[PDB]
Specification:
7 strands, globular, homodimer, structural genomics, protein structure initiative, 42% helix, oxidoreductase, 227 residues
């Protein structure tokens, strides 16, 4: 089907399970996909597979969210502007889980890395990409949340803190961009990272819906890809 | 009165604003207060005023949440252990507001600093002080939140993200320390940097209540001062 024909969508963390699947799904539904990640070799392989499966070859760009500066993000936007006239969607799928252990045991360097990737670099990249999103007829900006971004639970430490921060950033952005951008979060749920869990392919309907026109009047919300 | 007699309470950001008022109020109600802050001159001043009002002189310790490492926080806790048998309360009042302006205009350096102070260093200091809090009969740990930690609103940028993170941290801690610590947030609301708004003295009732016995086994909650 053709939901995303003539839509240009950037996917971060594009080499991991959910990111790869989202990139492939968007391409299957007609999108021009841009892959972002740390490792050129993994991105090239993802792009090659998408091309084989869809006839569409995504371009890719390198950014390491753990260490990037705002200037690096601005340079990435500049590279995008040479080849693309707008972004219709940005899916922020990059992330670090970090330690799953009590607060008394959480490693402080790991905590700082989780916050730096999930919150600070995600913010910096969003800022760099807002002008391109504003050029869409209806840009859609999607962050990745978690159940522990809405109710903190024991052992989830930095990840929980970072996903609450993500919900808050999303809400601030949605308020600022009423009638200009749609800004929402997806909680993928527990995914096949065991036969008890759903696979990334199973949770794709919500990923598609948030990028297609059916969700144009939806902003400021957090959605569960499962339940 | 004597609500806080024989309670040892550590207050961060004690050298000004709400922190200074909370330290002075707790001491007036009988607490043994420990002042934490970045500025020695100001901490000495506050300690001197408290002594004038109570006849008991609080100790102070220097910690700068913008710059401190985990090891610095551990060393601070070692210094407290030399002087004190437990902590009955920790009130995290230190924070940075940062930029109030649209997300497209937020300065990324200021954003990083708001997150470092309000989230990372607040976490690292909490971690260092947990063993002391567990030595209380009923330790109470209190974070500072905001209305924009529950509903994000335009222009509040890093502060909002950091106060959302603060609510999440509080909730994780409250879940881990069920039946062991009281862990809650206070949203002070709009207070003194203006003549129209409440002063820090006016919002103290909630700050006292969370440290006194009448709030025992209230945990995992966020309160408006309000």
């Amino acid at each position: 089907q053709d939901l995303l024909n003539d839509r240009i969508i950037l996917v971060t963390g594009a080499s991991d399970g959910i990111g790869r699947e989202a990139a492939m799904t968007y391409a299957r539904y007609g999108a021009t996909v841009i892959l972002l990640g740390r490792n050129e070799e993994k991105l090239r392989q993802v792009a090659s597979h998408i091309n084989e499966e869809t006839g569409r070859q995504p371009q890719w760009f390198i950014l390491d969210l753990l260490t990037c500066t705002s200037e690096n993000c601005q340079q990435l936007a500049q590279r995008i502007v040479v080849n693309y006239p707008r972004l219709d969607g940005v899916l922020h799928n990059a992330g670090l889980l970090g330690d799953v252990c009590p607060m008394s045991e959480q490693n402080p360097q790991v905590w700082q890395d989780v916050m730096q990737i999930n919150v600070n670099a995600t913010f910096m990249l969003t800022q760099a990409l807002l002008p391109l999103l504003l050029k869409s007829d209806a840009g859609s900006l999607v962050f990745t949340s978690s159940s522990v971004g809405r109710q903190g639970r024991a052992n989830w430490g930095a990840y929980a803190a970072s996903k609450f921060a993500t919900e808050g950033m999303m809400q601030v952005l949605a308020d600022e961009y009423q009638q200009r951008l749609r800004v929402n979060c997806i909680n993928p749920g527990g995914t096949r990272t065991p036969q008890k869990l759903k696979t990334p392919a199973d949770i794709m309907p919500l990923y598609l819906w948030l990028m297609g026109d059916d969700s144009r009047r939806k902003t400021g919300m957090t959605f569960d890809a499962q339940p």
